[PDB]
């Protein structure tokens, strides 16, 4: 409804089904969602992991060129600008098929790429055959009056990855994902702890429905610092729109000891 009294940030999450190896289709879906989110007063749209090509790691490595990635990237940049909304997307990285990772990028409403990140924690043998793991910590940046950060999918299941973002100042962690197999423990158990154990908000945007030989769970969610869902979807396509309201674990943690004990 109307933009509320105590809130200066409204975010949207796109939950949908991608078609493998059909970027025109999947990017048309992103464009649709961007327009709709913008019309509802959202200032940012989060979209799912590898959405533009589908979550099909082995086929991305075999069939998707660098030039095809770049064409999808340019189109997404154009959607951010033309729909007048900040956009988080996830594509393969820009290098050749044998050198690139899974990435996420944040563009603002003018189309500026503010931040780029390469997934550090690859999931399973197919991802590890198709992609190179990232080696850099999550980025943290001011946008819309808060410190935003990016992580991808499996990354968020590691407390260390969320802690790395929060140690840099993150307040809002945005996570494209691709979770199938009725893995209710990730949104149900791990995400709430990630939020509480850092005092942060996390947004988690999944595929749903039949795609790439899997049936994705949906369950997209925004979790606030008390671990509660600010908004959530079920198993069907949807656009989740959430107004964010404006123990000291981060100070208390004995990081110099912890780093020796991992």
Q: Which positions lie near ligand NCA, rule CB under 6 A?
A: 2-5, 49, 91, 93-94, 103, 105, 116, 123, 153-154, 177-179, 183
d(CA 134, CA 103) in angstroms, rounded, equals 9
Rounded to the nearest 10°, the torsion over CA 96, 17, 40, 43 is -20
Going 37 to 42 to 47 to 52, the CA torsion angle's sign is positive
d(CA 53, CA 177) in angstroms, rounded, equals 14
Which x/- pattern, by CB under 8 A, does the window 101-140 give for a copy of itself?
-------------------xx-x---------x-x-x---
Min CB(73)–ligand NCA separation in Å: 6
201 lies in the site for a copy of itself, by CB under 8 A: no
**In the block, residue with structure tokens 């099909």:** 56
> What is the helix, strand, coil percentage profile of the chain, to 5?
35, 25, 40
d(CA 82, CA 215) in angstroms, rounded, equals 32
Q: Given the complex with Cl ion, which of 87 and 200 has the nearer CB atom?
A: 200
Which x/- pattern, by CB under 8 A, does the window 208-227 give for a copy of itself?
------------------xx
Judged by CB under 8 A, which of 66, 196, 215, 230 binds a copy of itself? 196
Per CB under 8 A, residues contacting a copy of itself are 120-121, 123, 133, 135, 137, 154, 157-161, 163-164, 167, 185, 189-190, 192-194, 196-197, 226-227, 247, 249, 252-255, 257-262
């Amino acid at each position: 409804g109307l933009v509320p009294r105590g809130s200066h940030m409204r975010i949207a999450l796109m939950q949908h089904t991608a078609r493998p190896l059909d970027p025109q289709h999947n990017l048309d879906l992103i464009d649709d969602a961007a327009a709709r989110a913008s019309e509802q007063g959202a200032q940012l749209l989060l979209t799912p992991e590898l959405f533009g090509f589908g979550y099909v790691p082995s086929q991305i490595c075999a069939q998707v060129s660098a030039e095809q990635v770049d064409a999808a990237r340019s189109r997404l940049r154009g959607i951010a600008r033309d729909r007048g909304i900040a956009l988080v997307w996830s594509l393969p990285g820009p290098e050749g098929p044998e050198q690139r990772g899974i990435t996420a990028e944040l563009a603002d409403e003018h189309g500026e790429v503010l931040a780029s990140y390469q997934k550090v924690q690859l999931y399973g043998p197919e991802e590890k055959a198709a992609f190179v793991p990232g080696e850099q910590p999550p980025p943290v940046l001011s946008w819309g009056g808060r410190q935003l950060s990016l992580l991808v999918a499996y990354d968020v299941e590691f407390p260390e990855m969320v802690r790395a973002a929060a140690a840099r100042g993150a307040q809002l962690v945005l996570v494209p994902t691709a979770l199938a197999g009725d893995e209710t423990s990730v949104p149900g158990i791990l995400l709430p702890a990630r939020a509480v154990e850092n005092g942060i908000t996390l947004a988690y945007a999944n595929h749903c429905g039949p795609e790439g030989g899997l049936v994705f769970d949906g369950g997209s969610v925004v979790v606030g610092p008390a671990g509660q869902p600010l908004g959530e979807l079920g198993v069907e396509p949807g656009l989740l729109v959430v107004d964010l309201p404006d123990a000291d674990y981060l100070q208390d943690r004995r990081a110099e000891l912890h780093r020796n004990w991992l």
